[PDB]
Amino acid sequence: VAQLTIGNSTITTQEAANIVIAYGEWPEYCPVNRFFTLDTKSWAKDSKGWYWKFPDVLTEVGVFGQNAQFHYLYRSGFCVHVQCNASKFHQGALLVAVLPEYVLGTIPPYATTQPGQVGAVLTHPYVLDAGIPLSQLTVCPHQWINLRTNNCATIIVPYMNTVPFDSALNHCNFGLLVIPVVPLDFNAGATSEIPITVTIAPMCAEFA
Amino acid sequence: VAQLTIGNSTITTQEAANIVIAYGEWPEYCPVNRFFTLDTKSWAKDSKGWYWKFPDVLTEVGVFGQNAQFHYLYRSGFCVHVQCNASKFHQGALLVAVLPEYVLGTIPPYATTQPGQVGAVLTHPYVLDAGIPLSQLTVCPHQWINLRTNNCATIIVPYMNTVPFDSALNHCNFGLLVIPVVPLDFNAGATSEIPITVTIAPMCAEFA
Amino acid sequence: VAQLTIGNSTITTQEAANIVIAYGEWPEYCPVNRFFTLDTKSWAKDSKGWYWKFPDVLTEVGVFGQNAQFHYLYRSGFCVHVQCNASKFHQGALLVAVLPEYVLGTIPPYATTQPGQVGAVLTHPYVLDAGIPLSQLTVCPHQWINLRTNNCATIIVPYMNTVPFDSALNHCNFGLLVIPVVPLDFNAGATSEIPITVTIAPMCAEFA
Amino acid sequence: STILGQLCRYYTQWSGSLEVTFMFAGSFMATGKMLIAYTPPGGNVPADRITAMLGTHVIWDFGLQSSVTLVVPWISNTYTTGIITIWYQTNYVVPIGAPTTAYIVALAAAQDNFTMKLCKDT
Amino acid sequence: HSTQETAIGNFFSRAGLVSIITMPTDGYVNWDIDLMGYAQLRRKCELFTYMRFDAEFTFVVAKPNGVLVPQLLQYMYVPPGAPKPTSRDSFAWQTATNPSVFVKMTDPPAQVSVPFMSPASAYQWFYDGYPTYGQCPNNMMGTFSIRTVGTEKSPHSITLRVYMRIKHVRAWIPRPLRNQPYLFKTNPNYKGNDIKCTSTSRDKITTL
C-alpha cells in the first residue's frame, strides 16, 4: 500500500504496477497537478455501462476547469485510475478502455455528447452506442477489472490530435468506457450496489 | 503456483515441497512420460474410503496401458499426486498411504482385487478390509490431507519386488488407500460433496 | 550372399550392387525401420502384370500402418526389392519400374485406385491402363529382371511431392509396376507358376 | 466477433498459430477444475473425459490461476479444424454466501508466425 | 543402554516347536514345511512383507509316554519339485536325490540345516496377484517324510516333535500387525460379522 500525494490531494492505492501506457508513449512537453476524484457510480445487478468525455469531465471542477474557459488553447496528457470496492463474496468483470474520438450515434443532443462530471450511461452496450461491437474494444488501450483478482485499473494516456493545440471547449479528445462484460452477482443479504471510483490527474499540461 | 508440463499433459499445482519418498529411494534405471489424471471421487459426509491397485489402474487408459498388454515384462516406479478442492468453511482429514502387496480379505472376486481405473470402495475401513488395523497404517509411506492447512499430497514410490521383472497383467505391486480418518463436515447450504483428484506419472519405465 | 537384419526382420539376398537410385537422390531428413515382405504373386504363362500404390500398400500391415491413420502428416522415402525364384530351365523377362502420380484410367472405383497390400492386376498392359505406352516406361526409374542372368531388382525412391508434407490416407505418391514384357515359358513337367516376392523398407520416415 | 476473424475476410489464404485465452469471472471463494482439450485436424471430437485426456489438454484449476492460455499449433486454408472442448474435471465447489453460478470469457489472438495473402474484398 | 536385543536376528532366534507328528501302530507321514500353522510365528512373520532366511530343524523323537526303545528311523527330505512318497514301500524312499538321515531313538536328536530354497530373491507371505488359482505365492520350502526302516511293521508307536530355528534373517517393508483372529491358513480372511476393537474400553474419556 502506498500514499500518493500530489498537489494538496491524497489518495491511498496499493503497489500495483499494472500501468498500461496508451500506444507506448509517455506524455511529454515540447509540442492542475493534483487528483480529481469524481463522484462514484453504483454498479447494480443490471447496470449497462458509463462513459466520460475528456477534457469535458474537468470543466466544472475548479482550478483546471477555470483554466479551460480561458486561454483558448489546450494540450495535455492524462492519468486515469478506476478502482472498485467489493468484498470476496461478489463476482463480476469490468472492461475499462479509452477510445480516441468517441463519436456516439443516435437511435444527438448537447447533453449526451458531453455529459460533464457525472458522465452518462450506455443505452445499447453491445454496439457501444456507436455501431462498433464490444467484442473488438480490446484493440484500444484497455484493462480488465476482475473482482476475483484485482480491484484497480490505471491507464496513462498521451495527447493525440492532428493539430498540436486545440480548443478545449468544443473538441473532446477521447472517451473512457467502463462496461460490465460479466454482470455483478451476489447472494441475498450482501451489499446490493458496488461503488466505482474514477480519479483523473492531468499530466504535462500546457496552454501556450 | 507452478505449471508442470511433461509429455502433452499439463497440470497446475503449487510449490509444495512436501514430497515423501517411499523408503528413501528414488526410482532409477539398471535393474508413458506424462500425467494420467483419473476420474474424481466425491467425498460425501458418510464416505468410507477408496483404493486403487497399481499398475492395474493404468491398463485401461492409452499408450502406457496398451504397452501393458504387450512385452510380457514390466518394471517402473511411480509418482502419485492426490489433491482435494474445498473451501475454508469445510473440515476433514484424509490419510493417503501406499501399501505394498495389498492383499484384501473376504467377509474375493476378479473385480475387487483389481478394480481398474475407477477404484473400489472400502467396506470396513477400520480393519482396511484386510484384518490389519487403520491405527498402524502410518508405518507405510503416508501423508495427511488436513483441509484446514493443505490440499495436496504427493508420494514418490520406487519399484519393490522380489524379482527384477514381473508380468503387469496378473501381479499388482502395491495399492493406494485414501481413508477419511476425520469425516467431512460443513453447514447447510455449502457444497455437499468434495472432489478428490488422483494424478499418476510413471517414473523410470522399462520393458526389457 | 548377405543377411540383412534391420528391426526384427531378416532377409537373405546376394551381394548385388545393382541399386538404381531414383533421379540420383538419396532419401534424407530436413524437409517402421524393418522389412515388410508382402504376399507373393504367381507368374503364370498368361499373366499380364501387377501394380502396388504407395504408401497405401503399407496401411494394412502393423506398426507403420497404424502410424499412417494417425498424425495427419507423412513424409518418407522407400526401398523396394523385387526378386524372382525360378530354375535354369525357365525363361522370361520382367520390367520393374516406379511411376510418380500413377493415375489410372477407365475403359474408377475406390478399390482399384488403391488396391491395398495384395495389389491389383493390369487389364491392358500395352497402354499401362493409363493411355501411355509400355515402350516408353524406361524413362522412369526402372530395372530389368531377365531370368537368364539375374533374379533380383532393387530401387531406392526418395520423397517427391509439391508440398513437403501430405496426408497418407488420400494421396498416393507413386506406383510400382511389374510387367512381363517377355512371357514366361517352360517345358511340360516343370513348375508352372513362378513366385514374385516384394520387400518394402521405409527410409527416412518423419511425421512432424 | 474477433478482429482476427474479420481481417481474414479481406484475404484468401492464411497460415499460422493462434492462442486462445480463458478467464474466470467468479467469486474469490469458489474453486474447482476444468479440462481444456484440443483435438488436431483429422481426429474426432471425444465423447468421454478420459479419451480427451489422452490427447493434448491443460488442467485448469481456478483456485490458483484465474486465467489460462492454450496454443493451437497450426491452422491452414487454401475440413482441417482444431476442435476445442471444455470438460468439467471436478464439480464447482462453493461456500456459504458465494454465488452458485459463474461465467467464463474467451479471448483469441494470432501469434508471430501468422501470415495471410491474396487480398480479396468481402 | 544397549539396542542389541531388538535386532532382527534376536527377534527370530530361540528355536520353537512347529509340528508334533504321531505315528501309531500306513506306516509313514509327510509333513511339508510351513510356518503359518501356529498363531505365534505367523503374527510375528506378518510384520514384514519379504523375509529371507535358512532353517535348522531338530527331531526330538520318543514313544507316546517318554520312553525310548532301540529303533532305527529315517527322515527323508524331499526338495521342492521332487515327487513325494506314496506308500511305505515306494520308489521314492531309495532315491539318491532326496537326502535322508538315519538315526536311532536312543541318540541325541538329529539336526539338519536347510538353505534358502526359493527361485526368487526372498520369501513373500503376501502375494497380491494370481500365480496362474487363488491369490497365493509359491515359496514351498520342502517336505519331510518320516518312517521306520525295515520291511515288516515295527510294534512301537512313534511320536516325534519338530523344532526349528531361523538363521540369517533379513526382513523388508514393515506392515501393521494383525489384530483380528485368524480363520484360514492361506488368506487374510477375517470374521467380518464381528470386529474386535484394538483397545479395551473405559467408562468416559476422563476416567483414567
From TrEMBL, chains A, B, C:
Subcellular location field: Host cytoplasmic vesicle membrane; Host nucleus; Virion
Question: What family name appears in the similarity comment?
Answer: Belongs to the picornaviruses polyprotein family.
> Which function does this protein serve?
Capsid protein VP4: Lies on the inner surface of the capsid shell. After binding to the host receptor, the capsid undergoes conformational changes. Capsid protein VP4 is released, Capsid protein VP1 N-terminus is externalized, and together, they shape a pore in the host membrane through which the viral genome is translocated into the host cell cytoplasm. Protein 2B: Plays an essential role in the virus replication cycle by acting as a viroporin. Creates a pore in the host reticulum endoplasmic and as a consequence releases Ca2+ in the cytoplasm of infected cell. In turn, high levels of cytoplasmic calcium may trigger membrane trafficking and transport of viral ER-associated proteins to viroplasms, sites of viral genome replication.
Outline the subunit composition.
Answer: Interacts with capsid protein VP0 and capsid protein VP1 to form heterotrimeric protomers. Five protomers subsequently associate to form pentamers which serve as building blocks for the capsid. Interacts with capsid protein VP4 in the mature capsid. Interacts with protein 2C; this interaction may be important for virion morphogenesis. Interacts with RNA-directed RNA polymerase.
What is the protein's name according to its record? Genome polyprotein
Shown portion of the whole protein? 82 to 315 of 2193
From TrEMBL, chain D:
Cell compartments where the protein resides = Host cytoplasmic vesicle membrane; Host nucleus; Virion
What family is it from?
A: Belongs to the picornaviruses polyprotein family.
What interactions and quaternary structure are annotated? Capsid protein VP1: Interacts with capsid protein VP0, and capsid protein VP3 to form heterotrimeric protomers. Five protomers subsequently associate to form pentamers which serve as building blocks for the capsid. Interacts with capsid protein VP2, capsid protein VP3 and capsid protein VP4 following cleavage of capsid protein VP0. Homodimer. Interacts with host GBF1. Interacts (via GOLD domain) with host ACBD3 (via GOLD domain); this interaction allows the formation of a viral protein 3A/ACBD3 heterotetramer with a 2:2 stoichiometry, which will stimulate the recruitment of host PI4KB in order to synthesize PI4P at the viral RNA replication sites.
Function, in words: Localizes the viral replication complex to the surface of membranous vesicles. It inhibits host cell endoplasmic reticulum-to-Golgi apparatus transport and causes the disassembly of the Golgi complex, possibly through GBF1 interaction. This would result in depletion of MHC, trail receptors and IFN receptors at the host cell surface. Plays an essential role in viral RNA replication by recruiting ACBD3 and PI4KB at the viral replication sites, thereby allowing the formation of the rearranged membranous structures where viral replication takes place.
Name of the protein described by the UniProt record: Genome polyprotein
Q: Which organism is it from?
A: Coxsackievirus A16
Q: What is the lineage of its organism?
A: Viruses, Riboviria, Orthornavirae, Pisuviricota, Pisoniviricetes
* Residues represented out of the complete protein: 421 to 555 of 2193
Automatic annotation (TrEMBL), chain E:
Q: Which residues form the Picornavirus capsid VP1 domain?
A: 1-176
Q: Does the keyword Magnesium apply?
A: yes
Q: Which GO terms describe its molecular function?
A: structural molecule activity
Broad class of the protein's primary localization: host cell
Q: Which GO terms describe its biological process?
A: symbiont genome entry into host cell via pore formation in plasma membrane; symbiont-mediated suppression of host gene expression; virion attachment to host cell
- Give the coiled coil ranges: none
Q: Where is the protein situated, by its record's location annotation?
A: Host cytoplasm; Virion
- Keyword Magnesium, does the record have it? yes
GO cellular component terms, A-Z = host cell cytoplasm; viral capsid
Keywords associated with the record: Capsid protein, Eukaryotic host gene expression shutoff by virus, Eukaryotic host translation shutoff by virus, Host cytoplasm, Host gene expression shutoff by virus, Host-virus interaction, Lipoprotein, Magnesium, Myristate, Pore-mediated penetration of viral genome into host cell, T=pseudo3 icosahedral capsid protein, Viral attachment to host cell, Viral penetration into host cytoplasm, Virion, Virus entry into host cell
Tell me, in a sentence or two, what this protein's role is.
Lies on the inner surface of the capsid shell. After binding to the host receptor, the capsid undergoes conformational changes. Capsid protein VP4 is released, Capsid protein VP1 N-terminus is externalized, and together, they shape a pore in the host membrane through which the viral genome is translocated into the host cell cytoplasm.
* Family indicated by similarity: Belongs to the picornaviruses polyprotein family.
Q: How does it assemble?
A: Interacts with capsid protein VP1 and capsid protein VP3 to form heterotrimeric protomers.
Identify this protein by name.
Answer: Genome polyprotein
- Portion of the parent chain present: 638 to 862 of 862
